[PDB]
């Protein structure tokens, strides 16, 4: 019934070329089984967007990477919001969606839009950069630590913990062991910045411990809702910022047209999301015994889904392969979809919005002039470096 493969989409083979392999599991059926790791695998959008949205059956607080928590110990306090279930989830997820509103996007805006204008400025006097570690990593990193409210102290923590987060949701390989193996100063440094008397009033962290007081979180749950957007909050932004920058780069006909219109700023940005999905992979397992696309699954099995994936199957996107920033993106999974969809989906768009509108309308051309180095994550992806020469306009 279900075909069986023997692709590793953990294999440093799979990351530098994941697209041919994920045709493969897309073709092979809608539910397959991958030998490599004892787990079922879903690579089209029908069955990543429907397994997305069944939180039930396919439940979250046995955890998203292929350690269930059931049968392992996790690495660390489980999320109280991603690694959750409704009705435990919901009023986490309702106390971040309020931090991360509409209204709080408002209140940073202007300052997330002056240091994005500021650092293409300062890009634009060097001429030759390191788009990732001078821009993709420069900027957020500018900009979301303050809005948390954190110190200056020990930010260099900040990247090598996401990347950790991120690595450990993957199968017991090298990155995931040696990740956890150098965690101990990071964690320590994420932990204790988490308690209240250490965030800056007025930023994000101070907001979820004021969100203490309404029923909806008590005291001792707002650390580890701060800790949530330590781990989510900025790899992730960096790596969507990157493939954006990279897609302009390849993309010079979609760079003249952002040029001439930057209102296409927000498009552009939401079009890497799902061009180059900062997170591919991650999991989900079955409460039950499930039929999905004809398939019988098991009660208690992890089932991986490939949202990247899912975003380049040609059987939902016209052209998929290509970086169109006049796409019609909604629908993509990029951000997730259901209950779990991104909580700080608005702080992502506004840092890409803000930074693509600056390129939009201070650059003239994004040319690649030296080697370009994958960073090699289990669920993230994104370049190491990626050097360009930017023309100012
Ligand atoms: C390009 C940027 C980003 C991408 C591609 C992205 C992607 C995702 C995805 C796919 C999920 C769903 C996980 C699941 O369903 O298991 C998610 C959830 C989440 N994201 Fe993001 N994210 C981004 C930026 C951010 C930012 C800026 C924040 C916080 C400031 C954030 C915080 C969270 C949190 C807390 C969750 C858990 C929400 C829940 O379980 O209900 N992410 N993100
Ligand atoms: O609550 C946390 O600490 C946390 C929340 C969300 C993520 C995540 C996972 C997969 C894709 C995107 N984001 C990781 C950690
Ligand atoms: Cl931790």
Same mark, same amino acid.
């Given at each position: 019934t279900i075909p069986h493969l023997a692709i590793d989409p953990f294999s440093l083979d799979f990351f530098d070329d994941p697209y041919p392999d994920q045709q493969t599991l897309r073709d092979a059926g809608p539910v397959v089984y991958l030998d490599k790791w004892n787990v079922?695998?879903?690579?089209?959008?029908?069955?990543?967007?429907?397994?997305?949205?069944?939180?039930?059956?396919?439940?979250? $607080?046995?955890?998203?990477?292929?350690?269930?928590?059931?049968?392992?110990?996790?690495?660390?306090?489980? $999320?109280?919001?991603?690694?959750?279930?409704?009705?435990?989830?919901?009023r986490p997820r309702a106390v971040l969606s309020k931090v991360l509103s509409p209204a709080t996007?408002?209140?940073?805006?202007?300052?997330?839009?002056?240091?994005?204008?500021?650092?293409?400025?300062?890009?634009?006097?060097?001429?030759?950069?390191?788009?990732?570690?001078?821009?993709?990593?420069?900027?957020?990193?500018?900009?979301?630590?303050?809005?948390?409210?954190?110190?200056?102290?020990?930010?260099?923590?900040?990247?090598?913990?996401?990347?950790?987060?991120?690595?450990?949701?993957?199968?017991?390989?090298?990155?995931?062991?040696?990740?956890?193996?150098?965690?101990?100063?990071?964690?320590?440094?994420?932990?204790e910045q988490c308690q209240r008397p250490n965030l800056a009033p007025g930023g994000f962290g101070a907001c979820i411990h004021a969100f203490t007081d309404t029923g909806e979180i008590t005291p001792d749950e707002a650390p580890l809702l701060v800790r949530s957007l330590l781990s989510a909050g900025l790899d992730t932004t960096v790596n969507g910022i990157g493939?954006?920058?990279?897609?302009?780069?390849?993309?010079?006909?979609?760079?003249?047209?952002?040029? $001439?219109?930057?209102?296409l700023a927000r498009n552009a940005f939401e079009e890497a999301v799902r061009f180059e999905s900062p997170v591919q992979t991650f999991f989900r397992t079955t409460t039950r015994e499930v039929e999905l696309g004809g398939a019988v699954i098991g009660e208690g099995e992890k089932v991986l889904m490939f949202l990247g994936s899912?975003?380049?199957?040609?059987?939902?996107? $016209?052209?998929?392969?290509?970086?169109?920033?006049?796409?019609?993106?909604?629908?993509?999974?990029?951000?997730?979809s259901g209950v779990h969809m991104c909580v700080g989906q608005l702080v992502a768009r506004l840092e890409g919005e803000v930074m693509l509108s600056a390129l939009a309308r201070k650059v003239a051309a994004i040319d690649i002039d030296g080697p370009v180095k994958r960073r090699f994550n289990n669920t993230l992806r994104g370049l190491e470096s990626l050097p360009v020469k930017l023309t100012p306009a």
């Open positions: 079922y695998g879903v690579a089209r959008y029908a069955e990543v967007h429907a397994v997305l949205n069944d939180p039930t059956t396919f439940c979250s $607080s046995r955890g998203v990477g292929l350690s269930d928590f059931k049968k392992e110990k996790p690495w660390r306090p489980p $999320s109280l919001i991603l690694e959750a279930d409704p009705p435990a989830h919901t996007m408002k209140t940073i805006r202007d300052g997330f839009a002056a240091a994005a204008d500021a650092k293409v400025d300062e890009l634009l006097q060097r001429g030759c950069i390191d788009a990732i570690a001078d821009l993709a990593e420069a900027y957020p990193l500018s900009v979301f630590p303050d809005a948390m409210g954190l110190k200056q102290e020990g930010r260099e923590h900040l990247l090598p913990y996401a990347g950790l987060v991120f690595n450990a949701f993957g199968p017991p390989n090298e990155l995931r062991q040696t990740a956890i193996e150098r965690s101990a100063p990071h964690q320590a440094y994420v932990n493939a954006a920058v990279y897609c302009l780069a390849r993309f010079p006909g979609e760079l003249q047209r952002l040029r $001439s219109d930057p209102t899912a975003n380049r199957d040609p059987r939902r996107w $016209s052209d998929p392969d290509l970086y169109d920033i006049t796409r019609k993106t909604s629908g993509h999974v990029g951000f997730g």
